[model samples]
Target: YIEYPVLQKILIGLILGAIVGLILGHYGYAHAVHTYVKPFGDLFVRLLCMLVMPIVFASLVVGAASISPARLGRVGVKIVVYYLLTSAFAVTLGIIMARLFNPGAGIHLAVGGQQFQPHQAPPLVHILLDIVPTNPFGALANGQVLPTIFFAIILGIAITYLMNSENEKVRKSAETLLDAINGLAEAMYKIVNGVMQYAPIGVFALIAYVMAEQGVHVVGELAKVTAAVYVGLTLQILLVYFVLLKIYGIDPISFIKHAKDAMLTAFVTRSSSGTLPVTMRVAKEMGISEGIYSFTLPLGATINMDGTALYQGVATFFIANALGSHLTVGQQLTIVLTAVLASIGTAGVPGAGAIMLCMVLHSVGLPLTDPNVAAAYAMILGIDAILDMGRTMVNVTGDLTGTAIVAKTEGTL
Candidate 1:
């Protein structure tokens, strides 16, 4: 495994960036940092947003198609159930952690720009109807996240049916289409990796610019958010994954020993899909049957975003609190539902959590259009690399947890 020292470099960038920003802002050079550093951060974010459509569309279709209904007989059903349940649990735990920490408590920074305009709450029916886009092309073009998700899943199901058709020609054609989509998804991941190569620089510029504008105090607030995420991730691993393993008569310590490499690799790389080989290697070493590990591990990486969902929960609370908006029970429920569905569409790549957070915020009627809201959003983006590492570790661990548990239940372990 050729490990890139990206996480270490990012931490270095973050520390240096914070020191530079604090010293300069204190010395009244805030305007200079904003003028010189902010654009780099903005460009990085733009590049990420630019890949959203292609990556989400291609990856979702490829993911859904790969997990065909016909192939999803008993074991497939168990894996899906395990992935969804654990993800929902992880997200809920994240929200509780945020509530406990109140990570954005000290944030009262107001934007000097536009007035904050609150979005009116749409009726339940309208919101449900909105998920199914009238024109998927329009949704894709406009970057309408929820509708695009709906379109991609249905398209994937359709492709699966065509691939399973009794007519040889039809099946062959469907296979060809899927191959093309798979290739597109692969290319998109390569582009995502290229973007990530620029992440440390982006993290530095973003943190520096945010500090210059908001001063050094916001750093403590951001630290609280990071603390909440790490604590939540640890609780998730112990409370959820460990409990399940012990209940199934598997020793949690041994399981952790086997999962150590994948989890650490995931932490360093911050990519669940990238850690698949190590996960599979460990799964086999644990004596899980190929039939079970092969299907479960790869599929888990694609659809099982436990860590990302949890981060979304924390981010929703952090962003809402920072913007001085209270999230009611209804809105919180919307977050859980949106995070769960959004996880299905979330690609297993570094920085995908930030993109998914945008969808979660949108679901709860938190408009990013408000200058204040956008700044609050940018704050999360600023420290996303720090948060990404913990979440990715949880994500890979969750996959292994599910695979092992499922393997045991199927008597294949």
Candidate 2:
């Protein structure tokens, strides 16, 4: 794809799609394009989401089991602490901006697109009870993400234990399973490479359908959402992440200089997992230890959904506002918490944020079944690509920053 110019192909697709959408919308063909072209994008996103569980499961177990216990113990605790704190801050900042700017202040635009509604997020007690899978295979098959992550973590820890255990019987089996998992991880990534070949067409269809369905009148509303997201993301990068870099004695400029390509690639693709290989290359080029990055980065892409969390905050609040409903302070508080937690389970694929946003809105009692709320959501889909690009770039930057900070503190860079 490099010689054929993969990024160029995707860019050209976006441009051409935009042009076609303008023509189609003008000619009353928005319905046809919305019905037909949108599915190409839907299939593409589903393909990524389909493979995410397998990829994350394989990579988590293999990478976790690969590291020595002592090395893992030291780094594991530190990384988890940092990831949670930073991610929490990022989500909070998003909510703050949403409240201040009111990105959905006047957007009640109706559009031709129908927003996809996901199952509601359960109550906190039920969510806690459901976190541990009663049947791991069922969880995997049904795409219940939280339990799948829980199962993967526990499985990985057990594998690591077996790797270091003295029982020859179990140790040999552990080795075999580890080898199988490693092989699976490698093959899953190869599949990602192949899937990306269709990304241009998928993204093109995605952009075109949204534009045609919504028409040109939604531009102002779209810009409002886009601007708010960009502001939040910039604050996160410049304030939260930059301060961490300074505290760790890492130069933020040097970090971004080395990481710009990965960040830009993520922006263009709107996919953190899809941009994993590019980010890995940046880490290697910057002399970060492969051992530190190989596990931490992949795990980050899976669990550290700071950007997605932020976007959900904005989208949910925007929907409620646009629908002319103001929630109580308690409901608003629920949104912040739910968005961040739901992000943990969101697949790191292009446009997966929309589904996660649906979950967050559900948590705050904003049922997607409500026609007004549903209309608000569909309107946002029209301009999602604009917001997606900036947030994804910020997401990539956040991941890279975390990796660099850990490496600097460990004297591994």
Candidate 3:
């Protein structure tokens, strides 16, 4: 088992779990499976989550401090621009696809009495202001991602400055500290591999639970929306990541091959940040330097939600149609902007997309306050497990694609 490829193991788990779940669900054993089996999947995700902070901190700090200030800034600007631009492209593409298909042309929906408080994303200005952590310790403890990323990069910059200091003693001390940090980051990769050994089991249980709960039970309108999302996801990967990387002289096929493990991990777990450990390992296997992986992967996990943006673009319109309304040009424009910005803070994983949808719906004034409109969302929630699996895969793919492109630009790949 230890000798088998990670992807093979995970794929095997997915198949077996789904088969078991389907069989049992048909036989009315779903309750028993959910109670006994789902926790394994939950535990796997928590373990992955456990590694996020230390890995992000150790990796980002070391990677940041390892390079010259000019090059660091250059890489920073390039990746950030890439993230924002691709996100816009994703949402735009999604909206166009949804409009072309006109999914849910006359669908009315019910929620079974479910209610969701619209999740209000923080103001852009407030989000920016909070990036500098007033307390690094607290940020780390609480997993305050933006602030933690800010602190790590700044600390690294200061370390670089110290290493270049005029005083020999100061420079030498900084060098020692940098070595320790890089060593710690490198050490974390070993643990990533260790955690991944359990990935197959986690993938199995989670998929089983999902299959049993929603096996072929998709509501028709929501199925159309799901179809729209998946089509847009495919287009983004091919036209955006695949085409862009091919233009940059990176092989998309090879890139996807290397990233398949992280993609599967994210697909089953439905969490980009939770998939960080596996992503880090994949980056290493692809020969991406620690400096790039440390900064870009963590930062990408936090703000790079191309998949979520695409979903919101489609869902916003779908909701409008369900409510017997068409978004005016202005409302549609708001969807584009709000989707891009909302995704930045959206956690980009399972348990986050629905609330983010609430934010997007509310932004467009679709009147979720109306019971009918609210019920449509409830039906969406019912089918979200499946939608989430597809979108999370896309999210992780985007993250790896970005890392590969960044590596090429930095002359590291």
Candidate 4:
């Protein structure tokens, strides 16, 4: 596992699929690949889709409940603020960079034979009202992410209150339920694990289908978007992470040396939850105490999603542009808010970023129901693994930075 056999294999699958797709598409046998290889990738995606709501709800609930206001002292408060603020900055940077580059400009995706019924974009007031669901369980059942998240956070806070209750029965039951929620979160990870094992084949098939159907020009747009993503990622690390490192007087070179293992794991595996033990191990190497590292690291994993948020900004722009849509300043601002909120309890898994992108687009009135938009989105999925590497690296790096900063504030370093 340490050798990262999965990523290596996925890379092989990606390269081979690209070659096969180009050759087959260029020579006019794309239909063959589309018929045979596409289903494998679709299955992979459907498996991930199955886990999305459960993972989001369970993880959000556990993340919120575990950090009850009563339980969190000054350290917890600072960590939360720091995570939220930096995530805002990172995502803003991504949106700004995407705006400048316009990576998906001039690339009109195929709409096929599907009907494009233009509906009025929802007003800001309506969007806000809709977020607070009429029925929480119905939201979950219907796969409504925003409402589900709203319900989960409130439920988590309520559970926290119950856990700190004076009555033994209420407190005990709260603890019991919290355990079950955490277990459910863990169970989702187990399912994600199974799905990820199928990712290489999915990556291969998805890439091949896109290549065969859309031709090689889409890859050019892919390259542009990928560059935008990396640029945003680099800026976040250098501007955000390094500045934090300097403020704490932690040498940048040494910090990277200490944190490189976990960072590499994140880049390769694209799973922050999986990279956590390495993060903890690296924290130990940095001389952060167990108490600070324990709380900060886990919390960061759950909520500090600077990388994912940033990537969502870029990907949102990409999808919108590909579909010949323009995002207004107000709409993009709404995306920043959505990304920040959605960041909380978005499980750090392989395909979760794509799901979060769906949530962000939904907030801005992009109809995922439209086949045209869905086709553009598949282009995103085609290149997601590549994007996932950089974002996941930033995510783990943010975790380490938070751990170090909190430790310094506590005088534990």
lDDT of each: 0.80, 0.69, 0.69, 0.80
Clash totals for all candidate models? 0, 0, 0, 0
The true-versus-predicted C-alpha distance at residue 202 of model 1, in Å, is: 1.6
In candidate 2, the residue pairs with backbone N, CA or C atoms under 3 Å apart (3 or more residues apart, or in different chains) clash, namely none
Best by TM-score, which number? 1
- Residues 362-390 of candidate 3 have per-residue lDDT tens digits of 44445544665654554454345566766
Summed over model 1, clashes come to: 0
> What are the runs in model 3 whose C-alpha is more than 4 Å off?
1-73, 109-218, 328-330, 365-367
> TM-score of each candidate?
0.93, 0.70, 0.59, 0.92
- Determine which window of 10 residues in candidate 4 has minimal summed lDDT: 110-119
345: Cα error in model 3, Å: 2.9
Query: Per-residue lDDT of 1-413 in model 1, one digit per residue for the tens?
Result: 22457677778778898887778778757788778887787787777766767777777787677555874668888888897788768868877887888876678757865435566768889988998999999988887877878888888888989976899999999888888987887787778778877877887888787887887778989989999899999999999999999989999999999899889998888878888899899999889989999988888778886887678778888887777766665666567667666566454777788877766665456666667877788889878888988878888888889999999988988
Candidate 4 lDDT over residue span 91-194, tens digit each: 78988888877877677775666433446757789877988989888998888878988888888989988877899999999889888998898888777767
- Ordered by lDDT, highest first, the candidates read 1, 4, 2, 3
Candidate 2 per-residue lDDT over residues 1-413, each given as its tens digit: 34475556666766787678767878859879867887886676555545656765565565455333653667766776777788778777777777877666555443324432333567889878987999999977766666765676678668777867779998899889878877786677667656666767876776676567656655566667777788998999999888999888888888889898898888887778888999999999888899988867886776676887678767767777766565445666566665565355233555556656654454344555555565566556545556777767877888888888888788999
Candidate 2 positional error at 140, Å: 2.2
Name the candidate, 2 or 4, with the larger TM-score value. Answer: 4
